[PDB]
């Protein structure tokens, strides 16, 4: 006996309309006629390993461990071992972040060698005191801004690397590269900037994935050193994103057209979950996580209540009709949320 559950259900759907298992990466939307971005691919591929993390379905769970290598070598098959050739640095380190948990999970060496040769590149060679006096800049290309999106991905790689390796380098980078961002990337009351920039300087709009992310970071560094200060921080940037990214419902906002924010919820709610699921362990913020959890619900709820003859969704939880066409990054959301 098992006990089945919606997070099962919504996976091999997503599979079943997304998942080519010729070139064993991701279709962009159910027309099957692009495959999804280098980075955005990443984050299906964490998906993958939630889902695997989550489901009590034996049979599922063998079939998502083997979908974990899959995406891997796809991706490779298409754009190689070596990733340092994007100009993109979040581009790389999302990848390094996955491979760190693919290493987890499956104990492949080459995984723990992805992942510690591709942080250690933009570790090692794009964090510059010279500018905002520290910081990992976005680009490897031109050295212009630095952005929320590469540098709370990098502390939490570091913080996967450092539960791996236990080596107190990468626990010393995640530490270093966090007080950083929350000092010039946040406004110290929970909002994160989206970067800073030579020219202009801090630019103050707060997006989906960028809390996430930030609440991430935070989360493993108090796992990491006890200090209740990070998971202080990680409430407060919950907080605003619960008062802020919200419409008046208090529904997650829709984050499109762009290609990019679209799926912005993906990468919050994992996060968000591992907020939840320490403030469970630890009995902290009693009060906040009875509101944070039916606040999550709710929004769960709202996801699926959009109206398909299938178990596919779209990225506006706010509404019950597609306007357009269901797209893999935007889907991805509602299947994370029911997987945490």
């Not at 006990?3 to 259900?9: L, N, P």
């Not at 590269?177 to 010039?184: A, D, E, L, P």
Request: glycine share 8%.
């Amino acid at each position: 006996a098992y006990t089945a559950s919606d997070g099962d259900t919504a996976m091999k759907a997503f599979n079943d309309t997304f998942w080519d298992p010729n070139a064993k990466m991701f279709w962009k939307d159910s027309k099957r006629e692009k495959h999804q971005d280098f980075w955005v691919e990443a984050e299906l591929w964490e998906l993958v390993m939630d889902a695997y993390q989550h489901t009590s379905d034996p049979a599922l769970k063998a079939e998502l461990k083997t979908q974990i290598d899959d995406v891997y070598d796809g991706t490779v098959a298409k754009y190689g071992q070596d990733w340092t050739n994007n100009p993109f640095n979040d581009d790389i380190m999302w990848w390094a972040m996955g491979s760190a948990r693919a290493y987890q999970i499956t104990g492949n060496p080459r995984y723990l060698e992805a992942a510690r040769d591709h942080f250690d590149f933009v570790y090692d060679t794009q964090w510059d005191e010279e500018f905002a006096n520290g910081g990992i800049w976005w680009l490897n290309s031109d050295h212009n801004t630095k952005n929320a999106c590469i540098n709370f991905p990098a502390a939490q790689a570091a913080l996967y690397l450092y539960d791996i390796t236990k080596d107190e380098h990468y626990l010393n980078a995640a530490t270093k590269i966090f007080r950083w961002g929350k000092t010039m990337l946040t406004d110290g009351n929970g909002k994160v900037f989206d970067r800073i920039e030579i020219e202009h300087g801090a630019v103050p709009d707060a997006t989906h994935y960028n809390q996430g992310t930030y609440i991430g970071s935070a989360v493993g560094l108090y796992k990491a050193t006890g200090n209740a200060v990070y998971l202080d921080d990680a409430v407060k940037a919950a907080k605003f994103t619960k008062n802020h990214l919200v419409d008046s419902n208090g529904v997650l906002n829709y984050e499109g057209p762009n290609g990019d924010l679209k799926g912005g919820k993906t990468i919050l709610m994992r996060n968000l979950a591992h907020l939840q699921k320490t403030l469970d362990e630890t009995g902290q913020y009693p009060e906040f996580s009875a509101e944070f959890d039916e606040w999550l619900a709710f929004n769960i709820e709202m996801a699926w209540s959009h109206r398909n003859s299938d178990h596919i969704v779209d990225g506006n939880w706010a509404g019950q009709l597609l306007s357009g066409t269901y797209e893999s990054w935007s889907s991805a959301a509602a299947v994370q949320a029911l997987n945490g």
